[PDB]
Assembly symmetry: C2
Homo-oligomer: 251 residues x 2
């Protein structure tokens, strides 16, 4: 059995190689997730075929209970694995299985260096420095759903200043950080990636929530626990560290 692996274009996890060389199949791609998949394939001993998810979506449900994205590919048995920056969530665990996480992350703060600002609590109580999130993203939703008073206050500030505080996408948010007196609430993984590449930018404080990226499988897949095992071995032997360092490290 050659395993079909669903994934999604997303820097630095999955990219097309910058090459016009004759590269076919899996060799057309590079990135953290491709390196992970190679290691998994060598530990478990499987052949695989990487296929980009046709609709370019991660996976969400409609009101009929119909799914899209990589999740739908797994549900339909059109992929054996999803290897992507795919969050392990309660709702998704109802319909697919996941390995234990190969990467753990949390919402954090992207801001300029050399400022007394040190936490989310430092931002919440003031109005001089604007702060927000990508409109309708996971980070915005966290703040909308939060019953923690200090994040309830932050959401109230974001929701009332909806037009300016909430941005269209990650790229626009980073641009707003570099140009105005603004802080972007975003995932720690993305902050690490940006701060490595922009020396004027830094992470502020720690993690505001916690979640993991895991390898998705159909419910009952005999590969799920094997992949957990492989992930733990890669973690303990320092290989996850070196794969992260390969793709995240800047100049």
């Amino acid at each position: 059995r050659t395993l079909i692996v669903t994934t999604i274009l997303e820097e630095p996890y999955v990219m097309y190689r910058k090459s016009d060389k004759p590269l076919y199949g899996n060799d057309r791609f590079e990135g953290y997730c491709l390196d992970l998949l190679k290691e998994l394939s060598n530990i478990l001993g499987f052949l695989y075929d990487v296929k980009l998810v046709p609709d370019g979506k991660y996976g969400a449900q409609n009101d009929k209970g119909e799914w899209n994205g990589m999740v739908k590919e797994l549900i339909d048995h059109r992929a054996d694995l999803a290897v992507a920056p795919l969050t392990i969530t309660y709702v998704r665990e109802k319909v697919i299985d996941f390995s234990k996480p190969f990467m753990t992350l949390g919402i954090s703060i992207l801001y300029r260096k050399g400022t007394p600002i040190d936490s989310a609590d430092d931002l919440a109580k003031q109005t001089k420095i604007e702060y927000g999130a990508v409109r309708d993203g996971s980070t915005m939703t966290f703040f909308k759903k939060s019953k923690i008073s200090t994040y309830e206050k932050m959401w109230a500030f974001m929701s009332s200043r909806q037009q300016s505080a909430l941005v269209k996408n990650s790229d626009e948010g980073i641009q707003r950080v570099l140009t105005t007196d603004y802080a972007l609430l975003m995932e720690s993984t993305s902050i690490e990636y940006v701060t490595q590449r922009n020396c004027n930018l830094t992470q502020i404080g720690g993690l505001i929530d916690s979640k993991g990226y895991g390898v998705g499988t159909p419910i009952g897949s005999p590969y799920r626990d094997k992949i957990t095992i492989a992930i733990l071995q890669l973690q303990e032997e320092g290989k996850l560290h070196m794969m992260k360092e390969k793709w995240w490290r800047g100049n």
Copy 2:
């Protein structure tokens, strides 16, 4: 079926209540893990009976492949669950199953406030400020097994200065931090706990490795995936955050 839950005395996860009131069974105990277990019991709908692991050990193997501690309790079917600060590891996954993690942690640095020291790389290249770990602990072992050059250098410094750099236990390490020009490499969870209680102390840098605490079950237990589900719901509804804040927050 009343589930037998193996656990271990460990502040703030599992403690005896400071009370001479007539408290029996589960009511004799308090702590993060007791709160977690209560929530798990209410989501899944199980009765349970907390039993402290007789040998007071987490779980390790000898050369005959014989296990001890909470791991051995699970292997022997003398406990249905282990709910404790029990690390999900490759070797343990060979003999027991684990839920996905309810807490994620990594080695970090405990040091004084107001110093230019900001990372492990800042410590490694100098000798004026001594640094180390608890002798024969998980943190020391990480440095001993590491093939990362900057941690190889740190281990070389710890191993050559073996008598003074390596301490007997966590309590001795913290005391060495507060009295001498010294930094203790320790788990982020414990650093958070200490820094909340000592205002002269701070965490330095980020996480040096990554691991999770999970609920242990015997291999094949039908509770493992259910507990993962419950953990994700507690995470997403902010309950893991508030349980952490209950036990970790200082004065």
